[PDB]
C-alpha cells in the first residue's frame, strides 16, 4: 500500500474535487508497483444522480488523479446514498 | 465457459428481464466451478437512469439469474449508453 501521508493527500485532493457532486469517499485501498500505483474507492452519490453524471465525474477524477499523482491509476465504484 | 446453448439462454433471459429497465447487455463471460457457475456482463442503461435505479436493477437481475440458473452468480458492470 501507499504511504499513509500520500493516502491523506489523495483523500484531501478528492474531497475538494467532489464538493457538490458526491457525498462521501470510503473503502479506499492502495498498492504500489514501482513507477506505477493503484487506487480504488467507493464514491457515494445521491440516489437520483444520473448514471451519465456519475460516470463523467469518475472520468474527471481519474484524469485529475493521474496528473497530480504521477503513475497513479484509480478505479472508482459508484454507490447510491444508503 | 458454460455450454453454448446455456449461454444463449442466459443472454435471452437477460434481454427479456431488462425490457423497460435497461438498453443492452454485452461482453458475457462465463465459467464453471463444479456445481457453481459465474457470469460477468456489461449492462447498458440510459444516461439519465438514476444511480439508485441502476443499483436496484443489478440486484434484481442477480436474484433473477440465481433462480433461473441454479448455482449461477453474476457480477454486473453498469455503463451509460454511448
CATH no. for residue B15?
3.30.70.1350
- Any B CB within 8 A of A51 CB: yes
- Any A CB within 8 A of B77 CB: no
- Alpha-carbon gap, residue A41 to A31, rounded angstroms: 12
What is the edge-to-edge ordering of all strands in the sheet holding B24-33?
B24-33, B36-45, B72-80
Size of the A and B interface in Cβ pairs below 8 Å: 42
- How determined? X-ray
Could you tell me the three cell numbers for B49?
A: 437512469
Domain enclosing residue A81, as ranges: 1-82
A38 within 8 A of A10, measured Cβ to Cβ: no
Q: Which residue in A has a C-alpha nearest to residue B43's C-alpha?
A: A51
- Alpha-carbon gap, residue A49 to A70, rounded angstroms: 30
> Quick one: which of B43, B64, B63, B62 has its CA closest to B54?
B43
CB atoms within 10 A of CB A54: 25
A6 known member of a binding site: no
Q: Between the CA of residue B44 and those of A11, A70, A78, B15, B37, what are the distances in Å?
A: 30, 32, 15, 11, 23
The tally of domains found in chain B comes to: 1
Could you tell me the three cell numbers for B12?
A: 435471452
- The nearest CA of chain B is from the CA of A63 a distance in Å of 18
Amino acid at each position: 500500500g501507499l504511504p499513509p501521508e500520500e493516502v491523506e493527500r489523495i483523500r484531501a485532493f478528492l474531497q475538494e474535487r467532489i464538493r457538490g457532486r458526491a457525498l462521501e469517499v470510503h473503502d479506499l485501498k492502495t498498492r504500489r508497483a514501482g513507477p506505477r500505483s493503484f487506487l480504488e474507492f467507493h464514491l457515494v452519490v445521491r440516489g437520483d444522480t444520473p448514471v451519465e453524471e456519475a460516470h463523467r465525474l469518475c472520468d474527471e477524477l481519474e484524469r485529475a488523479l493521474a496528473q497530480a499523482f504521477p503513475g497513479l491509476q484509480a478505479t472508482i465504484h459508484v454507490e447510491p446514498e444508503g
